């Protein structure tokens, strides 16, 4: 397994697309900080450090919109879109002046700075750049 960060974002995407309540990703401190941002911004209900057959995991609790009416009752996603930006095969770093605005403000870009994991708004308010990890809306 070559990219746990993109594997987690992908674990979340596959889970939300079939409306599961939770899914387990193997745990790591860098992932916790990433999920810490998704809960505080409301893309997930939250998480907890759980244990699957003796191994340290993270159980991520998803949230969706209200049931819909018509032919397709499936409720609207809260995480419409999440994808890896910087990757092992190509690192992506921006300065503070070139941080992007995901979805015209309505989206978050998750960064790894030397002040820890931040959002594009947090990084702009602290005047620091870093590695552009992913983007959510």
């Amino acid at each position: 397994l070559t990219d746990p960060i993109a594997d987690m974002l992908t674990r979340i995407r596959n889970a939300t697309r079939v409306y599961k309540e939770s899914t387990d990703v193997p745990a790591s401190r860098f992932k916790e900080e990433i999920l810490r941002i998704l809960a505080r911004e409301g893309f997930i209900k939250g998480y907890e450090r759980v244990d699957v057959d003796g191994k340290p995991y993270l159980r991520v609790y998803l949230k969706y919109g209200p049931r819909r009416q018509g032919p397709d009752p499936r409720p609207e996603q809260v995480i419409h879109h999440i994808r890896r930006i910087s990757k092992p095969g190509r690192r992506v770093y921006v300065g503070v002046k070139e941080i992007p605005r995901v979805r015209r403000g309505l989206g978050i870009a998750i960064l790894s700075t030397s002040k820890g994991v931040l959002t594009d708004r947090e990084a702009r308010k602290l005047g620091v750049g870093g590695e552009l990890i992913c983007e959510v809306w």
């Binding site: 009416q69 018509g70 032919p71 009752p73 499936r74």
Partner: protein, 231 residues
């Protein structure tokens, strides 16, 4: 107005020709057969009826849908009890999505009634007598319950959401609420007010359909319950 003699009446069937979306309404599997979670049926029957009663206390019609040979008369009686439209024979595609056109068929049934108001010149060629009489019985077989409905219904009640998939498909395209009895072979998310329980046992169909109209009549005035139910 609920109960718990459902336990003596169904708790489901149908081995593992199941639907995984129907998992959360299952308790466990007995001798190679799925068993419904009657408590989940209870809490759903509560929510389901809370909607039904509100529709009775507002003059809304409920088009009852049952074509399987098990629920074909149970649906005929209990829907006639409340004087609500049913469909017992073939469900006709477009009974909602093309309602004006299938309704153009009861007006024919209507005028075929008033034609046999003798004479209205029933001094027609005898080959025309048994002809229109055929079309009358014919229309009678399929429209005897749909005629009562003379506008888009406000909700529908289905005994097998898998069997009556077309009716569910029509009601959803028209934003009309769907309530239904359903066991393991059915897609839960396609129903709006679910009653997870056996839909092959007349014991179960009668119990749920009769208790359905027991609310309908009591919420339109005049609580009277003793209804036919073949042993």
């Amino acid at each position: 107005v609920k109960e718990l003699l459902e336990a003596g009446v169904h708790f489901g069937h149908e081995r593992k020709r199941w639907n995984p979306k129907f998992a959360r309404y299952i308790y466990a599997e007995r001798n190679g057969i799925h068993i419904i979670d009657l408590q989940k049926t209870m809490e759903e029957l509560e929510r389901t009826f809370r909607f039904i009663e509100d529709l009775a206390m507002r003059g809304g019609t409920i088009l009852f849908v049952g074509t399987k040979k098990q629920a074909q008369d149970i649906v005929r009686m209990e829907a006639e009890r409340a004087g609500m439209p049913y469909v017992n024979q073939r469900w006709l595609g477009g009974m909602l999505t093309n309602f004006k056109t299938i309704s153009q068929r009861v007006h024919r049934l209507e005028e075929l009634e008033a034609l046999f108001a003798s004479p209205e010149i029933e001094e027609r060629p005898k080959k025309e007598q048994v002809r229109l009489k055929h079309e009358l019985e014919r229309l009678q077989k399929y429209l005897s319950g749909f005629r009562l409905l003379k506008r888009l219904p406000d909700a529908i009640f289905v005994v097998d959401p898998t069997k009556e998939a077309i009716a569910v498909r029509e009601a959803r395209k028209l934003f009309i609420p769907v309530i239904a009895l359903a066991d393991t072979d059915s897609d839960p998310d396609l129903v709006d007010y679910i009653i997870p329980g056996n839909d092959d046992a007349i014991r179960s169909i009668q119990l749920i359909l009769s208790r359905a109209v027991d609310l309908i009549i009591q919420a339109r005035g005049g609580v009277v319950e003793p209804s036919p139910s073949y042993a």
